[model samples]
Every structure is written in structure tokens, then in C-alpha cells.
Target: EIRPTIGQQMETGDQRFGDLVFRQLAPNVWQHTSYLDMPGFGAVASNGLIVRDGGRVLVVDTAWTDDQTAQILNWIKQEINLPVALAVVTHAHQDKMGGMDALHAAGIATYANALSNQLAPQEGMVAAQHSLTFAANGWVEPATAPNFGPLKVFYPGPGHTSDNITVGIDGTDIAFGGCLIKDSKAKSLGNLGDADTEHYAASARAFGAAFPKASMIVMSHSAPDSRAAITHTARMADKLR
Candidate 1:
């Protein structure tokens, strides 16, 4: 007998986790919620964005599970009728990359910085061996590079994670700054265990300066339309020094 898919399990019992929903931040730009409730480990829910431009769909961050990935795919099928032209992993964390394998299996092209690729194998190995010890979902590695469509991946420096990559879409002025920038009112800089604090701050400042013309900024987590949020993150970084 075929076993129940992860999606089904999540749907039946995870409703309390919150409704998985997608919000369109701008024309052709959508952000999908990874989980309704934040688990105790501290990540809460991660945001995965979908950008459609010039006949191609670009997915930023795959999210936490096969079920979450299915929800996103179903939404795209109903509205966009286009295959995912590219997929970008903003960082190497499990929540961001876990669904990668599911997306890749759907035939989408996946891309990430060279550093992420080099580290994925080792990370996956470790996660697999010790995942049950954690309450949050575990990692699932993608089999291929995520495609960029007309978008480009730029790495200012090793910040949040050594493999973090900021995605710049060709026709849009919005930059998805992975987890480098926190929400404007974020009390303390979130977690810095896997980050290079100094470099993280520098990356935020450099990204803000480099994209001065950016009319909007999208982050992996936090509210979507706040330039002040970006600046706040940069300021926090600067204060750290």
C-alpha cells in the first residue's frame, strides 16, 4: 500500500500550526508561509517567495517539508500554469533547503552559491544522523542547482550563513535578502550561532548601498515592504561593532 504523503499528515494535524497562505507582495511576487505556528527551536515560520517575470517563475527558498512544497506547487498550478524556471536557496539552513529535493524532483532548476553546494553534502549527512533530536523539521538536500531564469545571484560576503545568496531579479528592483536583515522592530539581532556577525552587518550595509534604487526589499522572514526594516538591520549590525 502507498504510504500517506507528508503533506497529508501535515494537513490533518498541522492546522493549529496555522493556515498555510500566500501573500502577493507585488505584481508577480508572492510569499508563502512555511508553517502556521513557530516551533520552539526559534525559527518559527520561514517565508518562501515566488517571482514570475517574462514568462518564467523563480522560487526563492524551498521551505520546510514535502507538504509545504506541495501547497506552493498547487497554488502555482492554479494561478501561473508555468513550470518553476529556477529555484534559489537563500541559505543552507534546513528550513530553507528542506523542500529542495521535492522541488528538484518536479524538474525545476535549482541554484545557490558555490559555498552552499560544497557544504550541503556534509550538512545533510549530519542532519540525517541527528535530526530526530530536534523538534523542527530536518534537512533534505536537492539533487541539482536551482535555476535563476533572468535573475542573478549575488553574494556580498559570508554573513547569516557562509552560503547566503541575495537574489536580484532582472526586471524588478526588489532584492531578497535571505535572513540577513531582521524586521525593523526586531529587539535583538536574532540568532548569530551560524553567522559571521561582523561580516553579516557589513553584508547588510553593502547590500543596502549597492541597491540604493531598490524601491522594495523582500526578506526571508519578517514583514515584506519595509525599507526601514532593512536599514534597521544594517544599523543593528553597525552597533554591534
Candidate 2:
């Protein structure tokens, strides 16, 4: 069933505990939403992306809760009629891996970097049991098991964590900016408790320089922004510096 509401789900016939919204950003690109109601911070929002290429579906990141991720999976099956071949975890956060157990139970493969795997458990979440660790260098196309075209994954430089990276759709130029970047609504670094503040901006700068053709930049929270989102992170990194 297609979820039109960010707060309700018909499958569960109950209110969705956390707010989530899914939308298509390109021919085969989608954005999934995740929301958390923090005490003083009020509602915190995050974003995830889905890649649908031909017969395969790939999820990048996940909602902050299991039920939310389940809804996202249902959307793919009912709306797209495609099973998720695998999920590419972007960072080490409950928001990024919160839906991991749900994905795992569904027999879906999930991959994350070594840093996320090492530190995510300390944050009280199940890390991606499988690893897709990237070195602090150039681009790599991690196991293309389902042959969903080329998802050029880049290390850029360590910022969000010691092993953070971004994935770009080869032809679409749609980049999942992950936690290393920020949306236009952001006024701060969002979450930096585990971030390499000093070098994060440098990483963004180098990474941003590589994607001049990016038409859309999908951050972990808020709506998809123009490539300016990269500049936003670069500036936020400096402001905090």
C-alpha cells in the first residue's frame, strides 16, 4: 500500500510512531523520511534514499524505527513490485541502521563501513552485520550483486566518521549525501557527537568538488536540495570550526 501520511499506516491500522514520508526524486530515485521527537529538540527529521533500477531495488540508509522501515519495504513491494535486493547503510546511527533488524528479518542484505560497524553498536543499534568498508581514497563500486547499474561510492574524506562515504547513481548524478552533508533547513551540523569536525568540512569540500554534475543532493534529513547542500555542509563545518 502506498503511504500518503507521514504519521499513519494502513497495514498496521495504527498511528505510525515516528513520522516518515517517501517520495520519488528522479526516474529511479526515492527519498524516505524518518522523524524522532526529542525532549528539547522537539522533532528531529532524517532522510533515506531508494534506488529502483529495472528489476532491482536498493535502499540507502533507513528510517529511525523498525515499523517505519517496514512501511518503506511495503511501499516497494506494493507500489513498485520489487523486492529490496540489499540496503547500503550510510553511517552509524539508529536512523541509518534502525531498520536493519527489520531488513534482516526480511532476508535482505545490508552493508556498512567498518567505522559504523564498530561504533554503531555503542550507540544502541544493530550495525550492518555485513561490511562494505571503503578506504580513505577514491571511488569504488561495492559488490553489484543485483546488477542495478553502477552506484559509485566515494570516501571523499573522513568527516561523519572514520569510514563515512557517499553513493552516486552513475547516469542520474543523484547523490545520497548522507550525514556528511546537510539540508537547506539545517543551521548547524545536525549530529556531530561522532563526527570528525576538524576534517569533515575538508572532506565535504573535496567530495563536493568531484560531483559538479549533481542535480540533486539528498541529505539524511529534510527535502532534497540542490548541490548547494554541499556548500551548506562546507560552511557549517567552518562555522563550527
Q: Residues 116-152, candidate 1: write the lDDT tens digits.
A: 7667786671121111110111112223322345455
Task: Identify the leading candidate in terms of lDDT.
Answer: 2
Model 2: CA > 4 A from native:
1-19, 141-148
How much is the lDDT of residue 17 in candidate 2? Answer: 30
Number of backbone-clashing residue pairs for each candidate, in the order shown:
9, 1
Backbone clashes in model 2, listed as residue pairs: 47-220
Off by over 4 Å in 1: 1-19, 36-43, 125-150
lDDT (Cα, tens digit) per residue for candidate 2, span 102-202 = 89888988877666778787878788867665544645535622353656677778787766778887779788778888765567776687778788889
**lDDT scores in order:** 0.63, 0.73
What is the C-alpha local distance difference test score of candidate 1? 0.63
